[PDB]
Amino acid sequence: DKPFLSAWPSAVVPRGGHVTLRCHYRHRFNNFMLYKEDRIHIPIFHGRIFQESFNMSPVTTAHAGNYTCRGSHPHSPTGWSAPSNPVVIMVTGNHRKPSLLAHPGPLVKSGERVILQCWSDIMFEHFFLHKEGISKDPSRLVGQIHDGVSKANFSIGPMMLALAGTYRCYGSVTHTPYQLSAPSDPLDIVVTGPYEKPSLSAQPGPKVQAGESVTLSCSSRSSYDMYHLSREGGAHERRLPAVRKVNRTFQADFPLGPATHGGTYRCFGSFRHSPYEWSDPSDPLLVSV
Amino acid sequence: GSHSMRYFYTAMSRPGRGEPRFIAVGYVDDTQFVRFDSDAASPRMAPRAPWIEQEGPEYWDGETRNMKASAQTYRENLRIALRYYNQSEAGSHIIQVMYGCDVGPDGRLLRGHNQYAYDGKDYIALNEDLSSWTAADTAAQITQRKWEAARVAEQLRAYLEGLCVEWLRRYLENGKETLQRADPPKTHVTHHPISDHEATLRCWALGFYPAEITLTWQRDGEDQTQDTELVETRPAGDRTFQKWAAVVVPSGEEQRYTCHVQHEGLPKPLTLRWEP
């Protein structure tokens, strides 16, 4: 019948990287042939029978393509199985990178939605949005063209921890659709809530000048493993582990530093092994120098 | 009598062999009534007992929508588990979930349950007060911290006290003539020699519902629970169950042995003996 074809560790792979295609069929991983989409029954490499998983390394642009496999079925009309599921190897690093931004921003309240906009001054026929990780499938969208740029709006939601993480986008051009640009700079999409918000406070307080000290404490009865201090402007994503105090609160003191310039601060708690899942934000606090 | 409703989730990763799979089944007492399998072509929550089939489309669409979300959540929970235990992305792992409610004969809640397992071992469990957790190891202690800060117990409790009991009462009424009518076992005793001086007596119970049953062998009225071989109760395929119990007896002493059978469907317990 039907094998299960898979790419490891990722079907989206940089040129110079490595990816392996496995063809699992009748509780085995060996004796199979490969097929690209356009030549639906021309087995590739002159009908090579792969006696194990097929390791493409280093990846070249010629590895990019839309694959199926067939496993050896030695008692049947053609002697091979039906075609597998199709796996698309996408090879990146072949055009200049596009740009990725989040509207309204990269901190998304749980259950809500966010738009990730990919855009470029190169006219890309399609854009791909890819969450960083193992065995993650990309989203495709055609690029609209307007004002001398091409762009696509990827809607992400309802926000849960599965949709949070580090995202990149990519462009492809008309006649090499499995050939992807270099990746956009990454964007961390963080989900906030519903873990309870911590409390923000300053020591000795929110007003200071000169070379005097200004420490911000983020505090909570809940057992956050880490805190994140965030001042409006995006120029401080400072993170510190929490310490438990005698009164049972969990706290982290953030010493601002010798040249503190101030602004409006908020803090978030997060837990071990989950850096993209944050608590609700604390009430805001403004510091003045 | 008293009754129970249970949902069981199995989420499994199988790298290189398929995509992660989510299996959910629902039970009232010993009777499965719904299933969801993410490996189906178009996954849907689907009837598995006749008395749920006349629920409207609003019911099926709500259940299916929730099962798709749970499949997505538990696929992500498999990934989170890899990080908590520092395990490779190559291995295959299994999360199991159970929750549900027990009601009395008046239909009111007797207790609620919610337990989780990873790779076949206890992971975290909701305590009897339905407001606190018990964590089996330091990984599970992470989940407990998060669930306390997110007040997840209050959500379990609100379900266990409300929808769980109201739906179980609705289901028991829907399937009253098969769910609340105990079918008594059909019984007999068979005899096979093992030598010229000993023989097996096997006591049989067939066709009974629900699965709870007691089979016991006595010899001159004394329980042989030490020399009795009991087989696990097994399903017949038609929503009844089967079981046997066997004891080895000296040839010529068969009449000293009595098999005793207790089941809800029996007005009084049966005493059986082997008759040549």
Binding site: - | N66, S70, T143
Partner: peptide
């Protein structure tokens, strides 16, 4: 009917 736990992760 099944339990609906939107947004709850391990």
């Amino acid at each position: 009917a099944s339990l609906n736990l939107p947004a709850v992760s391990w």
